[PDB]
Each structure stands twice: as C-alpha cells, then as structure tokens.
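Q: Could you fold this chain for me?
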Amino acid sequence: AELLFIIELTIALFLFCKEEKELGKFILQKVFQLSHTKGLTKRTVRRMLTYKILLISLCADQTEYLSKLINDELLKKGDIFTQKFFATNQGKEFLKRLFSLTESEFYRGFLLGNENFWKFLRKVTAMKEQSESIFEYLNESIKTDSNILTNENFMWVLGLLDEISSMGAVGNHWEIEYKKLTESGHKIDKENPYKKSIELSLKSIQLTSHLLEDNNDLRKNEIFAIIQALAHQCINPCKQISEFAVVTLEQTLINKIEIPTNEMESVEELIEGGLLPLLNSSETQEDQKILISSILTIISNVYLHYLKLGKTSNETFLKILSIFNKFVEDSDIEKKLQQLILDKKSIEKGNGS
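A: Sure. Below is the predicted structure, expressed as structure tokens.
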C-alpha cells in the first residue's frame, strides 16, 4: 500500500511538474526498480504497470525503459496479464495509452520496428471483447497518412488482419453449425447473435482491400502478400465471409491495381501469385474442390476483365490452360474451360470487329 501511495503521489506531482531536465528520468528509474522487486501481488503489479505506462507516456525520450516494459511485462509474464484483465475497465485504458503512445512524435521509430510489440498486439487480437478496439485503432492508423506503412511493418500487420479474419473464421464455424440449424426453415429465426463479429470481419476485409491501395507503390512481394491474404480469407467455409471475400478480391483485382508496365510488368506475375496458394493447397480438403471451382471462376473473371483493357500475351491463357490441365478429369474444370474459352472468343470477336 505504501509503495502504491508513493508511486501515485510522485506521478501526480510530476503531472503538476513541468519538464525537468532529468527529474522525470529519475522518476522512471525509481518506478522501474520498484516494479522489479520480489513478492508483491497481482493487483499491485497491475496498478504499477498502468502507472509505468503513464510515466512512459509523460516522458519523451529514453526508449530503453519502454522496450524493457514491452518485452518483459507483456510477453514473459502471463500469470498477471490474464486475458480477462485486458478485458476489464483498466485493460481498455492500458491499450489506449499504448496506442496513443504509438502516434506520439517521439517514441515512434522504435515503436514501429518493435517485432515483440507487434507480437503482443497479435496476442491481444486473439480476444473476444478486445478485438474491436484493436480493429478501430488499426483503422484510424490506416486512415492517417503513411504511418504503419513502412519497408517493415507490413507482413506483421497483414498477419494481424488475417487474425481478425480468423476470428471471423471461428464465427464461420459457428455459422457452419447455424447453416444446418437454419436448414429446417420452420421456426422463428432469432438467429445470428454475432453481427458484431460478422461486421467486424467485413470491415477487416474492406480494410485490407483499401490497404492494397496505400503507399501507391511497393516491391510487389507485399502485393502478392495482399493477394494471399485475400485468398486465405476466401477459403473461409461460411457463405457470408466467402461471398464478401470473393467480391472484394474481384473488385481489388479489376480496379485499385497497377499493371501499366510499372515496377511490375507481367499479368503473368499476378496470376502466378494468385495461383500459388491455390495450386499448393489443392487437393488438401474435401471442400478444396468447390474452393478450387470458386477461385478458378474468380480467375476467369479477372482474366476476362484484363482482356477487356489493352493487353496481349495470350500465353497467359496458355498458362491458365496448364492450370486446368493440373485440374484434369471430374469434368467440372472441363465445362468451366469450355465456358471461358467461349467467353474469350466472344471478347476477341468484340474487340476485333
């Protein structure tokens, strides 16, 4: 109790204090040393944790203490950072303080390239009632110009959005159960007590789609990563997420895409990047067949859309034919091939005539 009282009193007086040369440095060192003591309790360490993050916010420089806080406190100990603790009224405050730190003029360069911190955000994302706050923080960070978009801090954030869609996927398993539940069609619905989760997933997919537009250029490996993320979102069995993922994939491919002999100069590149997850994961599931049918339909549609504009190299058509040869027999790939070759003939007749 005395430790808590002294810490609160000194923090309050520092709040009343005005930009001392190192006084704040001394305060931070003392609070860190007091935190690293032995024994203590759960509430005590939690209160000193929030006091520590408040002090870090109040100070500007000295990133090393913040790095130690992130690493040791967030990643190592879990007996004090229960998943419910972040869900209490103080967990939201702590997360808000952390994110508001992430946008400060100081404490930004280290906070961006801070792999352990993004892993902590990954852990926080896998939570029922703390997901929407993280999603909102990511949404506002994306809306702000540049920010997260860097040479690094792309694969991790894409994985974070993928984990949001994975929460959507557990909702999709719920929806798989509810599909059979609603197949009767005899009783009053009162159904889907998960519009929060479903709409969160839809907004996540939209956020990824808009993220494909950000920064206006890239090394095309992260563009392939965006395509991969959209494909993995489309793998989701439930009809709602699958449908919105298909629609978003089609829209992103047709528009908001750069293929004017730019850094990336081959539609072959985009089709190969799209196909790699589809070919590698082919024949790995019972639903993999219908997934292949759907994604090949998407591929045919995007190929037709690209054919509509100015382009050449029907060797891309040869390559998709090779894909269909990798998907021989069954006759559904065969009938889709007949339909798409008819469509290609119609498009070529329309442009030539």
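A (continued): Residues 271 and 299 are 8 Å apart (CA to CA).
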